[model samples]
Target: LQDGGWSHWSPWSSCSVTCGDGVITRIRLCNSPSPQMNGKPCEGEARETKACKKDACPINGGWGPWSPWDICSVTCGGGVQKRSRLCNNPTPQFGGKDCVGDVTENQICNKQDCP
Candidate 1:
């Protein structure tokens, strides 16, 4: 009475997440002949999973929110009024890290005294 036959699946076990999404497993251990008195132990799946991905993991660029002050280059005597910011709020892909300072900002708009 020997029916447990399954022992040749163990070569895919290294993708449990290292970047974005992962899942890779492969295992089969029924002994291929470890069922003499019981018979029938390996009937389905011992361990087998798929789906794995690891490529994009670096992403650290963010700065998008400041663009609403552009109208005062010079209308009176002194002016500057400027505002800008855009790292993409998420544009640094793969390599990431690119938004760490001012994109564009100024202030002085209209001092009054133009004649």
Candidate 2:
């Protein structure tokens, strides 16, 4: 809960109202996601931003981003095969058995994002 990367400051001033007994009236606190991911609300899209050649496809039987990977499938024959390469080492590729593989041509298989 400490200040990691997101802002923890509340826009409203912090104060306590004395009630009848020894109890506080109300209290407010600000909470947000890590700023590194941006201050953008984290409740918008259900999925993360798609970044082809970066995000890998799903393993077993699932899906990841829908960009570059999904869209790239359409432009395969045009000398633009889906960039099924991994961004960094350790990360597996589409057919790494960790993620789904690109099935039929012009069709997205893994969870990789498309262009």
Candidate 3:
């Protein structure tokens, strides 16, 4: 499976299987020096922070965590413009002025006096 900009795989082997652009960012093996140890295949997620040498935009961008600037508005070359808000929590409703009831725990808003 492909996630973000990296590929994930479940290899059946006793030895460690290196993944991620030949750098071995992730390893899959049985009873290895890592997490997820078991007879089952060791599988996990991976991402490419830097672009591969074969990629077109080798400058590094796209996918993964969003920075403040990435979520904020930005001016284009011309009059065109775009804007975004970092919605770590659920958007407020009923003019509450605070995001609420977010179960993901990524963010919470105004939990002090609201009960």
TM-score (all chains, Cα) for each model = 0.45, 0.14, 0.14
Candidates ranked by lDDT, best first? Answer: 1, 2, 3
- Lowest lDDT sum, 10 consecutive residues, model 2, at 15-24
lDDT of 2: 0.36
Looking at model 1, residue 57 earns an lDDT score of 94
**Candidate 1 lowest-lDDT run of ten:** 33-42
Candidate 3, residues 73-111, lDDT tens digits: the string is 223222222323443343343333543233222223233
- 1 or 2, which is superior by TM-score? 1
Off by over 4 Å in 1: 1-4, 27-42, 49-56, 76-81, 86-95, 99-102, 105-115
Tens digits of lDDT, candidate 1, 12-113: 989998898889999898897788886777788899899998897999889989989999989999988989999998889998789899899899978988
Writing each residue's lDDT as its tens digit, candidate 2 over 1-115 gives 2332334323432222222112222222334434333344333323222212333343333444333543443433333334343323334444554444553334344344446
Number of the top lDDT candidate: 1
Q: Residue 9 error for model 3, in Å?
A: 52
lDDT scores in order? 0.89, 0.36, 0.31
Looking at candidate 3, the ten consecutive residues that score lowest on lDDT are 53-62
Give the TM-score (vs. native) of candidate 1: 0.45
Better of 1 and 3 by lDDT: 1
